[PDB]
Design a protein around this ligand. Structure first.
Ligand SMILES: [Ca+2]
Lengths: 235, 59
């Protein structure tokens, strides 16, 4: 996250970090005790993945961390149907053992298609993660978070040559300097509705980071909540 | 109605008969007494911060 600030322990208890062939390479959000939702470009199979909930400072021990193994990965069925479009950038990870919910490990709320969109339209969400704090720069040790304003789709489209599908939305500032960045992918774009946070987006892509005239591109969660609920049922 | 202020529902609103309004909440929550606000029904309901907001305090 570029231009954000440190989060406080327990401020985003639904946030998890993913580790694999590369350490802290992407983020994710707790759907429930056995499932995490992330970005599909983060988990192109062919590698083992570990999830850490209750994480705050990557290099220290807080005694709130819960590490779990990923036994199943389900990328959206239409992800990569076309090459390099980043459309449908979302995936689910099933855990080997269930997380123990507590103050530092809490699920993010997910409304129906109707209300997820309504909440997105409030126009102000929070993004967080351990990704790069500077374009092409180093990554964060302490979790970062940034409030980002929704960008009108019409201006969103005119800001890039690439295609912004109906499964995406732009968020960021016209002046630049503040943005999510490489390494934050899969992490949540959330909307706080009177003290309760709902997942409204998935950090997905961009053109460089924090560049004036450019905005962060996010997966529009409202278009995928039926699918999420359908695949993460507990028995 | 749900027309203005989400029909005075803390989370979800849906139009009822005679232009009435029925409020609802997400999982882990229960509809309060006032029929509009939502209250935790489980130990750790989704979407909420439960660590003493910036350092511990007393009320
Ligand atoms: Ca730690």
């Amino acid at each position: 996250v570029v231009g954000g600030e440190d989060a406080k322990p327990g401020q985003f208890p639904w946030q998890v970090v993913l580790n694999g062939k590369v350490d802290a390479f992407c983020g994710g959000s707790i759907v429930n005790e056995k499932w995490i939702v992330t970005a599909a470009h983060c988990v192109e199979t062919g590698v083992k993945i570990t999830v850490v909930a209750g994480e705050h400072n990557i290099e220290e021990t807080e005694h709130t961390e819960q590490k779990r193994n990923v036994i199943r990965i389900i990328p959206h069925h239409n992800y990569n149907a076309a090459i390099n479009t980043y459309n449908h950038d979302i995936a689910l990870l099933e855990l080997d053992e269930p997380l123990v919910l507590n103050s530092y490990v809490t699920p993010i709320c997910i409304a129906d298609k109707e209300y997820t969109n309504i909440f997105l339209k409030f126009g102000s969400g929070y993004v967080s993660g351990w990704g790069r704090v500077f374009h092409k720069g180093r990554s964060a040790l302490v979790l970062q978070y940034l409030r980002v304003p929704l960008v009108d789709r019409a201006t969103c489209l005119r800001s890039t040559k690439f295609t912004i599908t109906n499964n995406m939305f732009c968020a960021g500032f016209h002046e630049g300097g503040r943005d999510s960045c490489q390494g934050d992918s899969g992490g949540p774009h959330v909307t706080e509705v009177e003290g309760t946070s709902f997942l409204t987006g998935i950090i997905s892509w961009g053109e460089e980071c924090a560049m004036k005239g450019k905005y962060g591109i996010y997966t529009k969660v409202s278009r995928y909540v039926n699918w999420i609920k359908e695949k993460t049922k507990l028995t | 109605t749900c027309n203005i202020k989400n029909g005075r529902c803390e989370q979800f609103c849906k139009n009822s008969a005679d232009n009435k309004v029925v409020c609802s909440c997400t999982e882990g929550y229960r509809l309060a007494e006032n029929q509009k606000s939502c209250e935790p029904a489980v130990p750790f309901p989704c979407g909420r911060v439960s660590v003493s907001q910036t350092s511990k305090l007393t009320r």
